[PDB]
Every structure is written in C-alpha cells, then in structure tokens.
C-alpha cells in the first residue's frame, strides 16, 4: 500500500541554511528558563500562548508577530508572551493537514519545502526577540526546530500515546499535554508524570538517520485544560481537581487553561468570556499559571478552498482579532496585579 | 534532554541476515487473502487472533506455535488461526515495555537485540505456517517485520493518532483499530474511514533514512471492540451500533471483539463467558468476523522480577492455558457451524 517513497532533506541540511541566529538562541535561552519558572510556581507572573490557530501565510504571521512583539513591553512584569506557531490541523478523518505536510495549500504535499518555511518563520520570529510555541507531532519534524521552541505541547489526540511522553521526555522545551478529546484529565496527569522519567525510544537525527535515544526526563511538564466531551474544564471546580490528581502523582507543576478549543466549543467569541472566570481565579490563587488564546489579524475564519482568500484571517479555527487579544492582555495582567502581595 | 544518541542497526541489514523465506512468504501471501475476505464477509470462517499477551521468551513462544499448528487442521474449514505475536506491553506510566525495549528483561535496553530476535521469532512461525498478529507501534519498527505480518492492530491509546492511521493507510497486511480506552468507538471507526484514504507522511525507510511516504489506502480496516471506561462492548447492542456507526462511514467491513482486557475486564477466565456470548452472536449473525483470545502454555500471570520465572506463563496481562483455547476453538467452530445454511 506504498505508492511512493520520495526524497526528505534531513535537519542538517536546512540547519546550516537557516543556522540558529544569536538573538534566537539569547531569547530560547532565557524565555524557557522564565515559562520553566512560572510552570514550577517561582514566579507569579502568567504565561500566555497566543497566536493563530494555525499557520498557513508567514508573511501574516510576521506582521501578526510585529503587533504583538509591541504589546510585550506593556505587559511583561505581568505577562510572559509567548507567540503560537502551529504547523498542523488535527481532523476527525481527512482535510488540510497543515502548512508541514502542504505549504501551497494545493495537494502538491511539499514537506520539505514546509519545514523549510516552518524552520524560517520560526528563525525570523525568534530572532525578534520573540518566544515561539509549536505542537510536536512525531519523532521526525521536531529535528528541524526544536531549538527555536521555548514552550511546546502534546495535543489530546497523542496524550494516550507512548512514543509522545517518551519523545517529550527528551525535549529541552517545557512542554503542555493537552487533557483528552473525551475530557479525561487523569491521562493528561499520567501523561506528565510519564514524562519525567528517563525512556530508551526510537527516533531520529540530525542527519536523517534513525537511532535510539536515550533520555534524561523533562521536569518541565505540566497539564493543558481544553474542555472535551466532558464539557468545558476551565472551572476553579476543574482546576481543584487537576492540582489534586498531579499531587497524587508527586507533581507540583501547575495549570494551564486553553481559552478555546473545547473551552469555548469553538465559538471565537466565548474566548474571552472563559478568560473572565480565568481571571478572577488567578486573583485568589496561585494553581493556574497560563493560558493559550487563538487570535489573528481579522476575526474568525475561512474555507481553505476560496479564492482569493482574506489575509490575515484563519483558515481552520475561529480566532478573535488583535484589537480583543490586547483587551484580554490586559484583563490578565490587571489579574496578576490583584494577585499579588 | 538527550542523555545519549546509541546506534540502530537498519532493517536493510537485519533482513539480509534474517531473510524472506519461501514457507513464510506463501504463509503471508494466503493468509492475507483469507482474512481480507473474512473482514469483507465474503468468507463466513471466523478470524482468531490467539496467543499470549505479549512475548519475552521466543523459545516458549515456539513451543506453543507448535502446538497451536497443531489444531489448525483440526479447525481450518470453520475458523482462520492466527497467533498473536507482540512485542509491547502498554503502560500507565511506566513498566517493562516489552520483548523490542528490553529483550532480556533487565534494563539493558537492547533495542538492535529486540528486532533482530522480534523478526527471527516471526520469521520462524510463518515458517511453520502459521499466519502472526502484531500491534503497529511506530514508523520505525514495523520496517523490520511487517512482510512477515497478516493481520495487525492499532491500540486503543493511539486510535487517534495521526500518524498511526497514516501509518495503517501504507501498511499491506490488515488492519484492526482498537476502540478507545474510555470506551468510544465512533473514533475507531473515523481511524479506520481515515486509513482507506492516501496520504502523505513521514516515515523511515529500510536504510534506516527518514522519507515521505505516499501511501495508497488500506481498504482492509476493521474495528475491534475491546471494552473501556463504558464498560464492555461484546454484546449484540454494541455490535450494532457499531455497524451502524460503519454505514454512515461507507464502511464496509466486519466487527472483531477482543475477549480479553476491557471486555473480560482483565480477568482471563472471564474470556470463555464473553467468547459464550460472541458464539451466540455469530450463530445469527455474520456482523461479528474474528475474536481476539490471550492464552499461553501456563494459565495466569507472574512478575517480571520473580527468580526463576516460571515457564511459559505470562509476565504481563493474565492469559487462559491452551486446553481451555482448545476449549473456545471448539466452541467457535460449532458456532460457525450453526451459522451456516
Ligand atoms: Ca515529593
Ligand atoms: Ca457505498
Ligand atoms: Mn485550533
Ligand atoms: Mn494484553
């Protein structure tokens, strides 16, 4: 059931034409100590992954970036930001996977040239100082970027899944693992704890080869809440519960809450009002350390298959636009300042 | 988080040493055919997919192929026999994860000593003729055996996966996917809706080099029916609506019910009472086309850390010995007999 096996340039490759830049490595550097920090509870400041739902216009995205890099000096004592830099669409059975598996948004399936343009979005993004977050999907693509990525996840489809606790085991980045599609959040904590360990797995090189790995364990895990089947999670009711099934684990990383998604079930406009209640339990406590907001330039979204398509507006989930992202920057940081003492 | 990059020996290599022999080829070749139609109903024969949990002692593994090719002429006309053969055993968190991590059952990790000895165990059975099962764990594993393979399954905690459907889509051997651990089955039946699609994925090859695989679609998925949070799933309710939930997909193709794990509820002598009820089932109905039994020379369980371990009995999940498997052949045969007019 093989049609083909075609040519994949290994990370080497594309590492050396799009070498990790000074100021990228200066603000991995620092930004991952500062989310492993506010994840473990030493600093009360509120991490915020931001960004479009996914990537499918670089361009976009950099001036998406401009926008937010701007807003960062506002709110930094308050609010760590860190810029969301998807490159993959989960889907119930089929449809556009994502800007990796194809670029041009045409079904030419040009991988390399995917993670070619997925490397240097994320080079050029780092490069301006800002921090970059991104789902890692497998054992293969995170070799082309894992060092430009301060705060990764796990989605709730591969929260179950072996080979990603293991592979996140061997990641430098902190790394999220989204509860699952049903709800349950007892695997998302089995999933962290799983995580910390050392693990022997199978992946892959540099330069392309396969090998074994033997890892160290990441003690930078920590639970994601996206609401599931269940129905929404985002409740200081959830949260009790997440912190009290982490402490039977003996992990004391905290939580953080995805505004969308199953949060608000996939209503753009519910963001926000999931934020207000995120908000006013991070004045009373400590336990929630971030969330995670989809936004774009224009509100909401479009059909992949229009033409032209709108810039700047997404075209797999509903995102809010900039002008709320900022109103809800600042309903967070007034909530860290009511927070503290 | 990389403690060491060791070396993995290619499939290339191994399957010089380990060659394709002509018994094992024709075994593989035949033995496709007749479950493919089985999975179809174009063959009202029931499929059995037999054998311990999973292996960690080749040896004993022979010994009880043999005696398995031993009833194979005594059934064949009513029931198509093929022995379970895995390799992993999934985890909580942590544990042995089975005979390819850790062959010799000490934490020395030898993967490159795993796949050679995982290939030549397969090799050796198909050899005697008899058609194997194994779970599709990875993209790097299955390049060391998957032409030895007649029927494989994707599990419960990865039926959500990505890449595993993507994975199953190239794979030539059939496919079971596995409902979810909590119980949901629609999810089972979009994996396999989504592996009847081609794709384009990042895989390995046989060099042991990263590639893009184009794939052609597997049009022999199924799904298995194995219990979960829900509670059990083998009784004729579940079945069909499980069909149903089939034909709104434009599927095809037949149910099979583990016995074991969430449907006996890890109880093995529950495996006889919920294989009483599939016989009732397949008496009426040819909805229900294979049965998935976990039985071993000795009956039951042990630790992997006993000194001695006994012979021949699992070290993972509890099986039924093989007088009782005699037992439920018989019964599956007669069912069988029944149906048919
Ligand atoms: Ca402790
Ligand atoms: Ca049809
Ligand atoms: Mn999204
Ligand atoms: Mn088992």
Chains 1, 2 share one sequence.
Request: glycine share 6%; hydrophobic share 40%; net charge neutral.
């Amino acid at each position: 059931n093989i049609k083909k096996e075609k040519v994949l340039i290994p990370a080497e490759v594309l590492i050396q034409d799009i070498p990790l830049l000074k100021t990228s490595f200066e603000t991995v550097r620092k930004s991952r100590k500062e989310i492993a920090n506010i994840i473990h509870g030493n600093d009360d400041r509120v991490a915020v992954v931001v960004g479009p739902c996914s990537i499918h216009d670089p361009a976009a995205a950099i001036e998406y970036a401009t926008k937010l890099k701007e807003q960062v000096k506002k709110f930094h004592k308050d609010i760590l930001i860190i810029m969301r830099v998807y490159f993959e669409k989960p889907r119930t059975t089929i449809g556009w996977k994502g800007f990796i598996n194809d670029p041009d948004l045409d079904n030419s399936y040009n991988i390399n040239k995917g993670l070619r343009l997925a490397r240097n979005l994320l080079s050029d993004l780092t490069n301006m100082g800002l921090p970059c977050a991104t789902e890692f999907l497998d054992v293969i693509t995170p070799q082309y970027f894992a060092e430009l990525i301060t705060w990764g996840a796990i989605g709730a489809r591969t929260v179950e899944s072996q080979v990603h606790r293991e592979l996140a085991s061997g990641l430098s980045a902190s790394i999220g693992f989204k509860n699952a599609t049903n709800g349950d959040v007892q695997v998302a904590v089995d999933a962290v704890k799983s995580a910390t360990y050392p693990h022997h797995f199978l992946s892959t090189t540099k330069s392309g080869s396969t090998a074994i790995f033997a890892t160290k364990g990441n003690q930078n895990g920590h639970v994601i809440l996206r609401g599931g089947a269940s129905g929404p999670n985002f409740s200081k009711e959830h949260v009790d519960d997440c912190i009290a099934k982490l402490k039977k684990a003996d992990i004391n990383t905290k939580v953080m809450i995805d505004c969308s998604h199953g949060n608000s079930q996939k209503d753009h406009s519910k963001q926000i009002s999931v934020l207000a209640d995120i908000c006013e339990q991070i004045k009373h406590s400590n336990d929630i350390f971030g969330v995670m907001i989809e936004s774009n330039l224009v509100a909401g979204n479009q059909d992949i298959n229009k033409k032209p398509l709108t810039y700047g507006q997404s075209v797999t989930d509903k995102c809010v636009d900039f002008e709320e992202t900022v109103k809800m920057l600042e309903m967070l940081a007034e909530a860290v300042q009511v927070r503290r003492g």
